[model samples]
Target: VECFEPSMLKKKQLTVLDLKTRRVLPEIVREAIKKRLRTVILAPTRVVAAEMEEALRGLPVRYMTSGTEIVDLMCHATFTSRLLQPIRVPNYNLNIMDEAHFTDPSSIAARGYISTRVEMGEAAAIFMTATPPGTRDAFPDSNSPIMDTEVEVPERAWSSGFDWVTDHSGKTVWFVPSVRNGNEIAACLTKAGKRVIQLSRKTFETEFQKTKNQEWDFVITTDISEMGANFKADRVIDSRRCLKPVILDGERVILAGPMPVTHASAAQRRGRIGRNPNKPGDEYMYGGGCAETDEGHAHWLEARMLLDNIYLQDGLIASLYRPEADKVAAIEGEFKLRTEQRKTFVELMKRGDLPVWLAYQVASAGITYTDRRWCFDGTTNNTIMEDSVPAEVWTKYGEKRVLKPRWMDARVCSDHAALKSFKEFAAGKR
Candidate 1:
């Protein structure tokens, strides 16, 4: 629940040893402890720790440094063994690991410390990070069974409808820039066309504050846009500035960087383009130019290396695909084609055989092909009907109640008409 930026502390020279913790940290801690919460605050520096202790004075909380005696005491100390074995109180509801990314396996301190805590039955350990190190093997084996769940706050809902369409052509254009060159390039695109809309961090924040309303035909952003920032663009045109290449919307143009080392970043970026998850035909355009090549290629190479590490750490091949059996079979077929020189598909899978989600799509296609004519058609219809419902109603009434069979039949017929129109347009017969 506590969101913080460590760099902000450093900028103000407010280390762990600082006299007073910032208003943000102390408020979060006080609120948690007031509810009889057992929490850990990971401080970036010793000065920040001291400041936190002072702020949370009299609260039933103990702060421990990474790889220190206090951590050992919490994990191993027995009440019966010592006269005063750090009096363990009940109602230990929260354990906050500040600077959570440091607990990554590669870190000396994290490796030595986090493992011990895992043995202590610390359920619900929360790790906070603005840019958490995208490292696998950070948590203990027991903690590996974690699941991700998203809770969307209604207050943050955003909407932008048909703002990107041109009056005459009704064709939409989305422009995104390479990270380093986004600002300048966005300016150029603005000058070229009146239909284009620019959405940088400054403009987004501004729009967010005033009436929480604005419309854009195109949103130009750096890596920050890849996160949870919301905007509507039917097609995503990746300028190839990212570290890893992402396949968005099957064939729609999508702006993407090179591959990232971790799955989380990759998932976050993909989430941006397919905002209307139910509609599968959104276009993504990959910008093709020599200028977009050099940086993109270099980053892709590094991303491959990171992917290798992730694959090695996880025992399975990319789990992103569905009908896991078929994907495994397809990969095995590929390996057989290589004969004596071929590596096992499982071995390749461990080396990031393919992005998990992408693999799932491929596997799903394989499965659907066996069962029906068009695998994506059924899935696409289901997705649109499912995602379009209001969350509150969906939560109250199950999806089946909201999606009637007649409604689905209508969608199928409507889809055919749309496809016919698209085919005519593409064939220049429209």
Candidate 2:
């Protein structure tokens, strides 16, 4: 599944080159350089861009930051260090987006910029990331499918994520939330007679070299080193919390709270280890001080994505036939209902009254009443209807109404209640 072949540079389709780690960047750069294709690499952050530039030092590559002048006119590759934002890209032969999962349209406003670049024939696009979104997940606005191919890492390049406990020995990398927290941790570890180094944006290049030389027993880093700096650590500890150091009352203390760690970010941190396939022994990763936060964040992430889909205006209608004949009142009512439904979903999500994934399923299924039936009245010609309520209507009003269906209602109702109801119904104790 090597999708970054030199021939792919000429292909007119969006190819997702899924490598196991950022270590593959040098290899891909070598291939593109050999093919004589001037390429532009988009790093998710400046640190990643710097690391890529460092890795491709011998090769003809130029690194560009915000407002930086590009003087290397004869370079084979240009590494752009910036987040996913609206910016003019130089017309290179090929474009490679490192950590392309960061190109999330729902969060970032520059939603379809990458797709537009490809459509305008600006450059042959290649999304190179370890965690690549599915075709529809990332590019729902794209007119065509995104071709994906994965490069499998060797069996030895696997880390025991969250399963290994450290014995306070050997080389390790700790992922913290901020520079202040990392520095505090590094200081404490260093005071305890362990060679620890904290790497920040300013000191990353210098401290990283020391890490390569095995000068430190522990390497402390924020999210800057989360992606693609080659580390020779045997273990990684991902503290899923944002604990920033603050000086209060002339003493330094940490403000502690849980932070959401996405699967992509966690994977990137873990992938930093087990990179040295040539080295012997097992690599371990321990992460997630709080699993509950991660779960809530995952559901919340999906909830936001579904909300985006509902609000997406592009390609909304294939053809609106005879729109002029539509009644104004009906159109107004429909728009109002859509707005209320979205508001209700958001309210439920914030209140934690409903799991976002379950809510989405019920909402999409268009809930219907299960016990609706017609009743005849002897005195009148009109028939009376019983239980005609639409289950889906509850979503419009922020009501936590549970359907009688067990599969859909399992998580909301307690098992004891369900068991009691079952027994009472069976024994005529209603």
Best by TM-score: 2
Name the 10 consecutive residues with the lowest summed lDDT in model 2.
Answer: 369-378
Alpha carbon RMSD to native, model 1? 22.6
lDDT of 2: 0.44
Rate residue 274 of model 2 by lDDT.
Answer: 54
Q: State the local distance difference test value for candidate 1.
A: 0.31
Give each model a TM-score: 0.29, 0.47
lDDT of 1 by residue, 222-338 (tens): 444443344454445444333333333332112344322233232333334544545554544433322222222222222222222221112422211111112111221121112
Question: Which TM-score value belongs to model 1?
Answer: 0.29
Among these predictions, the greatest lDDT belongs to 2
Go through the candidates in order and give the C-alpha RMSD of each one to the true structure: 22.6, 19.2
Residue 28, candidate 2: alpha-carbon lDDT:
67
lDDT of 2 by residue, 1-430 (tens): 3555666667354677765224566776777777776676666555566666676776666665534322122111122112111234455666666665552222121113343445556556676666554221211211122222122211111233312322446777777766655656666566557788777644665667777665778788876675467676666666644432222332112233436455456556666655554554434344343332222223223323332333222533111111111211122112212444444443333332343443443333343211111111112222111245312212223443323332232223222333344222222232
